[PDB]
Every structure is written in C-alpha cells, then in structure tokens.
Design a protein around this ligand. Structure first.
Ligand SMILES: [Zn+2]
Lengths: 705, 233, 103, 92
DNA sequence: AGCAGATATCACTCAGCACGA
DNA sequence: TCGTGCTGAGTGATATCTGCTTTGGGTGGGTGGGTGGGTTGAGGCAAT
C-alpha cells in the first residue's frame, strides 16, 4: 500500500531522471559536453507536475527525497544551466566581434528549458518549515531533506565556481532589458523567482538535532550533535564561500543595480520584500564590530599570553607530588568539631579547604530552563539565539568585499528600501506573521547600527544615509510592533523590537549630539517616544527579563541603558513634555527587586560577556547605589558571592578595566555595608532574606531610619 | 640561578637547629604532610627572596614552577628483613643493588573533560586516583546532564617507574636467597639508577591493598609493601 | 503525539585561540617564500600527481611570525592539529579547487 | 517513600540558626579598611558558609542561599521572626 | 555475593488563578 | 503590585527490583586467542 506506492514513486522518478539527459561520451572532446534528451522540457514539466500534485496537495515530502536520492539536480539541472550560460556568453562574444554574427538555434526552446530549470531549482531550494499541524511524513523527513539541501547549496556554490548564479543573473537581465511599462506580469514573476533563488541560496544552513524525550536520558548520554551530511564540511556552506562566489560571479553588482533603481524604473511591489529578505539573510549572523577592527601573529601571541596567565592561576590548585601521596587534613570549626579533607593544597591553604568541602558535596538543587526551539516558530538562526561572541571569521579579501557591498548599498538605496518596506507593511500590518516582523526589525536595527559604527570610525560617511529611521512612520510602526508583541506574549518579536528600539534610541542620541537647532524636530520625536505607556513598557521589560534566555537579558540591559541615557541627557538639556517628564520618577520606577535580580543573573555569566556589558551593568549599579541611594536592594548574598567570584585570582584577569570597575564598586559597597552592619546588627540576618514589606518596619529596613 | 627546583636537605641539620628538632621528629613520623608543607614553604621563600630583594628576575616563571625537597640521612639503615608493620607510613633508609627498572609509566595528574553539546572544556583535579567527573555541564546556559567526555591526550601526566632492589651481600645472615623490595620513583628521580648499581634510597614505607579480581571492589587481607622513594644516592 | 527536544550548533562555544592559529597558518602556507613561493608551488605539484601528504620544513616555520606559530604548534600539536587542517583546506580551495575531491 | 530533609522554618529558628547568627556574627566577621576587598568578601562568605554547613550540611553555599530566599518568601513564621527582630531593634 | 540496567512510584518546580490590599 | 493557598501536569530523581558471571579448568569450547595464565614429558625433526 504505502510502501509499494513509495517504491513505484521512486522507480518512476528514477526513470524521469535517467530520461532527462546526460553527458555525451561519444564525442572525443573532454571533459564531455552535456547533451539534452529528446523530451527534456517535457521531463521538466512532468517533474514540476509531480511536485505540485504529490508534495504539496497531499502534504508529504516523498517526491523531494526521491529527487535527492537520484541526484537530479547536481547532475542534470546545474550542468544544463551552466552550458546554456556558456552558450550565451559565446554568443555575446561573437556579437562583440560582429553584431550580425549569430550562433543560436531553437533559442526559444533553450530559454524555456532554462526557465523551467530555474523554477525547479527554486522549488527544491525553498526553505523548509515544520509547524504543529505538519503531517507525520513531513515531520519524519525533516533532517534528511535539510541535509540534501546542504548538499545542494554546496554544489551550487562550488560547481564551475558557481556559474548558475551567472545564469540566474542573465535570466533576470533578460527581464531588465524591457521597459517597466512593457514589463508583463510574467517578467515580474521571473524577477521575483531570481530574487527568491538568491535568498534561498543564502538562507540554507544546518538544522537542529531533535531528540525524543519520552524516556529520561541514558547513562551514556549525548555523544554529539552533528547534522552535516557525509561529504560536506562547514567550510563549504559558510557565508565566506557565499561571499566568494557572489564576488566572483558579480551577484553583488546585480543586487546593487536592482536596489539603486528601486521604485523608479521597476515595479516596487514585486521587488521590495525579496530584497529585504536577501539582505536580512546576508547580515543576520554578522557582528558589525568585527568589520571595524602579521596581525594574526600578534593576536595569537596575546591569546597565548592570556592562556598562560590562566594556567598560572590554575597551577596553585595542583599538587607538586603525585595523587597517591596521601596527605590528610583536619580542620577545626568554631565549635570543637573536626572535618577531614584530602590534598596538599588543603594543608597549605584554608580557602582551598573550604572550596574542596563545598565541591565534594553530592546534592544538587534542580535548575529548570525554559528552552524554545527556534525551528518550532519557523525562524532561522540569527542574533536572537546565536551565542554571544560567535564570530564569522572572514578572510581579508572577503571582508573587504562584504564591507564595500554594504557601504555601497547604504549609500545608494537603504533609505528608499526602508521607506518602501515601511509603507507596504504599515498598509498591511495585521497580515504580518512572526517571521516578517522579526525580519523587518532585525534588518532595520542591523543597518542603523552599522551606519552608526562606520560614522564613528570614518568622519566622511554620515547619519544622513540612515536618516529615514528618524521619520515618524517607521518609528510608529516599530513601536506598534513591539507593543503588540509585548501584549500578546510573543517574546521573539519582543526581542526583535527591543533590539530595534535600542538602535533607534542610540541613533536619536547621536542626532541630538549633532545639532540642537536642527534637533528640535527630533526633540519632538523624543517627546513622542517617551509616552507614559511606553515608559511603563520599557520599565516592565527588565522585570521580566530574568525568566528568559541570556540574550533577552542582554537586550533588556542595553535598552535600559539607552533609555536612561536619553532621559538624563534630555532632562539636563531642556524640559520634556509628553505630561512633563520627571526623570526621578522614571528612575524610581527602575528601582525594584526584579530589576536587580535580572542584573545579577546577567552578571553571573561574566566569563562569556565582553567588557561593555559589565560596564553597563556596573553603571546601572552605580545609579542604584549612589545616585538613587536605594542601597537596601544590593545588600544581598547573590551579589556578594558573585563579587567574590569576580575579584578572585581565578575569576577575572588582573590587567583589565572591568576588574577596575568591579574593584571600585566592591570598595564602595563594602564600606557602606560595614557602616550599616555597625549600625544595625539585625542586618546580619537580613542579608539572607528578601526585603520585608511591612508598613511598621519597612522603612526602617530600607533606609535605617 | 641555575633554574632547578629540587632541594637536597640533610635531616641532621634539623637537629642542628633548636627550633626544628620537633620538625625532624615529625618528618620521621609523619613524612607526607611534612614534605608537602616543606615544598610549599620552599616555594614561599623562593618567591619572597625576589619580592624582598626587588631583583630583576622574572616572577611569572617562578610562580609556574613545582618545587620539591629530597631529605636524606634520616638515621641508621635498616634491613629488608627487619621491616615490620610498625614501620608503615614512616621514613626509612635502605641500601641494596638495583636488579631491574620498568619503562616510564604515565601517571595522571589533571583530567581534561569536554562537553558534547557546547564544546566547553574544564579541568578537574585528581585525588587518590579518583577522577571527579562533573555530573553536568558547569555552564548556566548549557546545563546538559551526563554529557562529559574525557580527552585522554589533553590531560596532564607524570613520570612513574618501578624498581626492584636486593639487599646487599653483607645483609644475608647465613647465605640463603637474598630478599628483595619494590621501589617507586616519580619525576626527576626516574632513570636515576640503572640495573646493577648499588644505591641508597630514602622513602616512605607504604602498604597498598590488592584486588582479588578485576570485576569487583573485593580486597585481599594481605597487603603489599613498597617504598615511595624521595631521594636516591 | 510526542515530546521532542531540539539542540542547535549555534549555541556551541568556539575556540578563539585555535581559530587564530588557523588564520596564522593560512598566511604561512600562502605567503612564505625563499624568489618563488615554496608551498604554493608544492600544493600545485600535489594537484598534478594527485598526492595526499604535504611536507612542511620545521625550519621554515620558525622564521615567520617571530616564532610564535612554531612554538604554539610544538607544545600543543594534538590540540591545534584539527585547526591546521582547516587552514590547509581553505588555501587548497582558493588555488586548487579540484584537489578537495578525491580522484 | 523517604521523607526528604528541608530547610524548614523550624530549623531556621532553632538555637543553631538565626539566633546563633545574631548571638555571634559581629565578633567573627570583620571588614577591614587595611585589607583587600576580596579578602573582606571572602571573610564574610567564610563565616556564613561555616554557619550554613553546621546548620544544613546537605546543600552547597549558593544552593543554601537560594533555599533561604524561597523559605523567606514562603514561610509566615519566619516572617514573624524577622519582624520581631526588627521591631525589637527599632525600640532600642 | 556483587554489579549494571531498568522499571515505576516518589516529590518538587514553575505555572496561574481567586480575594484584598 | 504582595500573600496565601488551591490546582496541576509536567519534569524530573532517587529509592527501588531483574539478570548475569565470575573462579580458573577442561563437569564452557578450538569459527574467543597463544603476547591473559597453565608447562613438564615424550616425541619427531633438522642441523650437526
Ligand atoms: Zn555544555
């Protein structure tokens, strides 16, 4: 029944694959040229019909697996496209030699075959998304099809140095050759097909490792999480290879040409969204700091020295003699009871003895983490879930090419693209799905931040290229998106809106720094954006941040920092009217036990953060402790333990400004804590427990008076 | 000046000083803890010399070294036939002839573990030859339980060697087959004496249980004796 | 009708030092010369004859990069060997794309 | 079917517990201006860790802290105790 | 007798709502 | 936006049962090996 039907399907698709065509070995010329079969176009049409009538309408993916099994793509479609592109190039060269010279027959048929091949390529390379309603067959074939997609991408980027990209560019230029008014809907569909092909090629990436949870994990445990096919390495599918291929095949020039003449010589409705998606997939995994840094040897020496210092600090925990030397220690508690520890370090040191006592303990309190698979929502891997510090290692030439492409785009058409996208989306807000919201917000944030960084580095290129972010249409769109995401409890869109808002606040701060008189119109924007509801929302974000992932926390922290920065600067500069803004009221709004908790939680992970995150956290702490005089908040034990960890020799490198901040804060905190303890012995007990909420005594606790 | 670390100490010098007669007796009675204390103190004085003399010598090099002490001349040398259980875990002197020495044996010091899920590495020390493998990943973000793998070639090892010693001819009372004792040497003392060489060894008389079989924690009643050498002459 | 947990490869912690070793190794194999390029020519030689092994003179390594690269490889060869192979493949890809695939 | 050991309010209020901390915690702890900040932090953590160990050996230090947090949030007797303390001190 | 794998029955955490404050 | 239960099913965890096999010796074999042990006595063979 089902198995027999699967066998028939596989046999029929295998016959189709063998009937499409193959290399002609009769000719003595080597390497042999690909030869089209008698019914090549009919075979491609039949394959498309199979795709339509089996893969989609019956909600299965057996056709794609059958196609991948018999290598229909890597052996038939790509060679056909490459050969057609080479024929067109030869024809162009002949025309250059003599315009009347022609070496083409059945040109219409060849173009038809090429177009059908490109359509089938887009069909096979379309992103795969698994939902809750997906059938059992669709769920079961996810990983294998993702691996086949990885193979497809590797072949596309490698074969003939990626000439199928040039074939697609030629197909698009065929449509570009006719005027906008003369452009039929078919031509616009072809353009959208080419753009979708490029987006799919960039998007593909390794999938997730899905494991059944029915049974508690065995005593063996997890071996490894590998989704790569047998003969595919991360070097083949990395963005580095994509950049190399695009530069070699002049894809960047075609995209720049499309995005520079956007909304002027083209129909924007077809092209705006594909360009936005292409650029988001381009710049989703790229950190902008890396783009503005032999030097490799110098960095290697510095890293080796860092590891040497870490090893030196580790050495104090190792015994000079072998393990079986057998030294036994007895340590006396304040009461006359002796505890036993083993190890030379125990005898020679006391802190080591207590650390070993702690470490030796078997019982662990359960830690429950709320993990959400990104594949569940259909989103791709991006900055939201990528671990902080994950760096895309570009080569020098590839990095230069990517920077040049981004700079040209930002100086050519970022303004127009943002305007068109914002208009189209605000016209059709409700139809938005989570993917489109995240995509728009992340693209906006990334490009704004990159322009800010380049403006800082280079005095020429300036904010006027990204000035369209300031305009109120985009601002209100972003605000509505973030607020709705908050209200509906959609945390991923919340995160994206958070990032976008942080970038917008940094931008507005820079514009105000530029010129005040020209920034009166931006004082208007500042007044609009700091609306009481918005204030409330922004304040609430941190309080909830503690529940979610690390990245959530970091975005919360950064947005808080930006909000306080703008609030203080604009209160000092002039008066603010939303309802007048009382900076102290907001500040106070920011002072509660959840916020602090959040901060603490974020700081616990200090071995992965940079110095900027620590600087922001301790700036907040300074605001709390000194400016606000809300010291009772910080008289906790989580902070004390974490600060011991930070200041310990094994925790943080001595030669670091972060350690300077930590040491200064620790000095001040210890001084004030000593004063409080001298005043009220009760605080010794108090330290252990959350604040009291008692009318009688609450004040006393909080402020000591 | 020479960059070496091992220090040779004459136990009689402790008796030559009023303060350290108790220390000498303790070393004779409790050698392991006293030796560890002596090593740490030697390192402390070595660093303090540079600290006080504000010399130009690099301190980081000193901080990363391991220092040891090699006491000798701890009393009259006993015989392999006069070692009773009362001498267990005590410092002894023994003269004999070397008969054989096994090749260098790698002895584990620090264990290196790797997470199978996040590529996170951590080093855990070894106590009494017991590897303290984590129950779960130490990373907050990655709390994956029971996913730690031991990378054998990235761990820290030490040098060990077993030597067989025979009593000197004069120690045989009547002319029977001379008895033999097993010696263990670590680090610099390895390859410090070849076969057929007459040597004097200072070490700790130790006893170790022997497992009945390889499957089980079951132990033999009878214990095996050997010497943990600390100085070879 | 089932409970399923997903793990991602983007959560993994990278070895920053190892990557820099790969970066330094790529430069050494691509720019070292004694005046024709030594290892660029050797990679070409393996391409024609379809050879696997590539021979590097340790004396040459110590010259470039002040000796930091040579010293790092000497102490930690087991740790850094996988990263050296990553660097070699990248250089092979740029100049001998067909060498990656077996004959 | 074995009762687990928990840091109950009962425990906290016993002679070995909060009253122990109040009786002798200023004598053992000392924050020195002539000492490094890390040293003072380690001294405070040392005192509280030994007290915790004495009180409740099952848990680690940090775990202990967490447990303390939850207990204090939940238990109404503990709350009473705390309030009592505070009140008595405010009356002095 | 001891050891390694497995079943199943034992609690505990975050989840969220009704009252009142 | 704190406090105090009542509900709750999910996510554990740890207190709790179900099947080898072993020593060494042919009362497991030679399609488990002879570098994991046994192993002294007779017998046939080549170099001497
Ligand atoms: Zn991990």
């Amino acid at each position: 029944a089902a198995d027999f039907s699967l066998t028939v399907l596989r046999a029929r698709i295998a016959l189709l694959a063998t009937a499409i065509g193959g290399p002609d070995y009769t000719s003595q010329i080597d390497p042999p040229p690909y030869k089209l079969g008698d019914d090549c176009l009919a075979c491609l049409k039949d394959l498309k019909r199979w795709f339509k009538l089996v893969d989609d309408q019956q909600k299965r993916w057996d056709v794609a697996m059958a196609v991948a099994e018999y290598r229909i793509l890597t052996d038939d479609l790509l060679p056909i496209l490459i050969d057609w592109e080479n024929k067109c190039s030869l024809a162009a060269k002949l025309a250059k030699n003599n315009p009347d010279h022609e070496e083409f027959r059945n040109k219409a048929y060849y173009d038809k075959i090429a177009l059908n091949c490109l359509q089938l390529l887009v069909l096979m390379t379309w992103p795969l998304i698994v939902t809750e309603q997906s059938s059992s067959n669709q769920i079961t074939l996810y990983g294998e099809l993702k691996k086949h997609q990885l193979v497809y991408k590797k072949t596309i980027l490698s074969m003939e140095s990626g000439k199928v990209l040039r074939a697609a560019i030629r197909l698009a230029l065929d449509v570009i050759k006719i005027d906008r008014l003369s452009r039929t809907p078919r031509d616009n569909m072809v353009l959208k097909l080419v753009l979708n092909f490029f987006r799919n090629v960039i998007a593909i990436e390794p999938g997730e490792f899905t494991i059944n949870t029915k049974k508690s994990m065995p005593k063996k445990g997890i071996t490894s999480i590998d989704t790569l096919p047998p003969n595919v390495s991360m070097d083949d599918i990395s963005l580095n290879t994509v950049i190399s291929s695009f530069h070699k095949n002049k894809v960047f020039g075609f995209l720049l040409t499309l995005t520079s003449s956007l909304s002027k010589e083209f129909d924007q409705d077809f092209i705006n969204i594909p360009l936005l998606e292409i650029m988001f997939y381009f710049t989703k995994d790229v950190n902008q700091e890396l783009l503005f840094p032999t030097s490799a040897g110098f960095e290697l020496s510095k890293l080796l020295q860092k590891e040497h210092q870490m090893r030196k600090n580790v050495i104090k925990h190792t015994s000079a003699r072998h393990s079986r030397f057998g030294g036994l220690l007895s340590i006396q508690t304040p009461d006359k009871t002796r505890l036993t520890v083993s190890g030379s370090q125990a005898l020679v040191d006391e802190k080591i003895a207590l650390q070993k006592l702690d470490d030796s303990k078997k019982w662990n309190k359960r830690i429950i983490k709320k993990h959400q698979s990104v594949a569940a929502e259909g989103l791709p891997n991006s900055l939201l879930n990528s671990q902080t510090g994950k760096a895309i290692f570009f080569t020098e030439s590839n990095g230069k090419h990517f920077k040049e492409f981004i700079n040209n785009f930002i100086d050519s058409g970022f303004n127009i693209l943002l305007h068109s996208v914002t208009n189209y989306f605000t016209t059709e807000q409700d139809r938005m799905v989570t993917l489109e919201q995240v995509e728009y917000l992340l693209f906006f944030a990334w490009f704004v931040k990159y322009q800010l960084l380049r403006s800082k580095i280079d005095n020429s290129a300036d904010i006027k290229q990204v000035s369209e972010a300031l305009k109120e249409v985009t601002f209100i769109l972003v605000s509505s998106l973030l607020r709705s995401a908050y209200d509906l409890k959609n945390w991923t869109v919340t995160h994206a809106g958070m990032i976008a808002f942080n970038e917008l606040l940094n931008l507005v701060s820079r514009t105000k720094a530029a010129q005040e008189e020209d920034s009166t119109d931006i004082e208007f924007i500042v007044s609009r954006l700091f609306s009481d509801e918005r204030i409330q929302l922004l304040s609430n974000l941190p309080k909830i941040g503690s529940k979610y992932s690390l990245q959530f926390m970091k975005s919360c922290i950064e947005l808080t920092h930006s909000v306080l920065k703008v609030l203080e600067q604009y209160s000092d500069d002039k008066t603010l009217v939303i309802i007048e803004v009382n900076f102290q009221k907001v500040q106070a709004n920011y002072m509660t036990e959840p916020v602090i908790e959040t901060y603490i939680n974020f700081l616990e992970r200090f071995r992965e953060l940079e110095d900027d995150s620590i600087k922001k956290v301790f700036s907040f702490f300074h605001r709390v402790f000194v400016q606000a005089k809300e010291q009772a908040l910080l008289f906790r034990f989580d902070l004390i333990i974490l600060l011991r960890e930070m200041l310990s020799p094994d925790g943080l490198d001595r030669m670091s400004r972060s350690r300077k901040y930590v040491s200064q804060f620790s000095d001040y905190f210890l001084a004030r804590l000593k004063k409080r303890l001298k005043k009220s012995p009760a605080w010794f007990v108090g330290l252990l427990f959350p604040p009291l909420h008692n009318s009688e005594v609450g004040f006393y606790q909080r402020y000591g008076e | 000046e020479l960059g070496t670390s091992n220090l040779n100490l004459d136990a009689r010098n402790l008796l030559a000083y009023k303060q350290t007669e108790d220390l000498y007796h303790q070393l004779l009675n409790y050698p392991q803890e006293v030796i560890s204390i002596m090593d740490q103190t030697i390192k402390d004085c070595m660093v303090s010399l540079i600290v006080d003399n504000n010399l130009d010598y690099d301190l980081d090099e000193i901080e990363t070294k391991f220092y040891k002490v090699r006491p000798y001349n701890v009393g009259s040398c006993k015989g392999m036939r006069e070692l009773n259980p009362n001498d267990i875990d005590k410092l002894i002197n023994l003269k004999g002839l070397v008969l054989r020495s096994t090749p260098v044996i790698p002895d584990m010091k620090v264990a290196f573990f790797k997470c199978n899920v996040c590529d996170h590495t951590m080093a855990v020390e070894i106590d009494r030859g017991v590897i303290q493998e984590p129950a779960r990943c130490e990373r907050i973000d990655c709390n994956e339980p029971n996913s730690m793998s031991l990378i054998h070639n990235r761990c820290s090892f030490a040098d060990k060697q077993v030597i067989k010693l025979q009593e000197t001819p004069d120690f045989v009372p009547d002319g029977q087959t001379p008895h033999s004792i097993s010696l263990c040497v670590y680090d610099e003392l390895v390859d410090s004496c070849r076969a057929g060489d007459r040597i004097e060894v200072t070490g700790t008389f130790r006893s170790i249980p022997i497992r009945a079989n390889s499957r089980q924690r079951v132990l033999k009643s009878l214990y095996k004796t050997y010497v943990d050498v600390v100085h070879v002459k | 009708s089932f409970k399923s947990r997903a793990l991602n490869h983007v959560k993994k912690v990278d070895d920053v030092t190892g990557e820099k070793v790969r970066e330094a190794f790529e430069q050494f194999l691509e720019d070292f010369s004694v005046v024709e390029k030594v290892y660029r020519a050797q990679i070409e030689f393996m391409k024609i004859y379809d050879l696997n092994t590539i021979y590097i003179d340790y004396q040459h390594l110590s010259m470039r990069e002040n000796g930091a690269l040579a010293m790092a490889i000497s102490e930690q060869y087991y740790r850094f060997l996988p990263f050296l192979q990553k660097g070699l493949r990248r250089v092979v890809r740029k100049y001998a794309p067909e060498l990656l695939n077996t004959s | 079917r074995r009762p687990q050991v928990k840091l109950t309010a009962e425990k906290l209020l016993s002679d070995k517990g909060l009253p122990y901390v109040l009786k002798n915690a200023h004598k053992r702890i000392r924050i020195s201006s002539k000492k490094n900040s890390y040293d003072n932090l380690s001294n405070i953590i040392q005192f509280y860790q030994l007290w915790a160990h004495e009180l409740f050996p099952k848990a680690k230090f940090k775990d202990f802290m967490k447990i303390c947090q939850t207990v204090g949030k939940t238990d109404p007797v503990l709350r009473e105790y705390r309030v009592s303390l505070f009140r008595d001190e405010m009356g002095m």
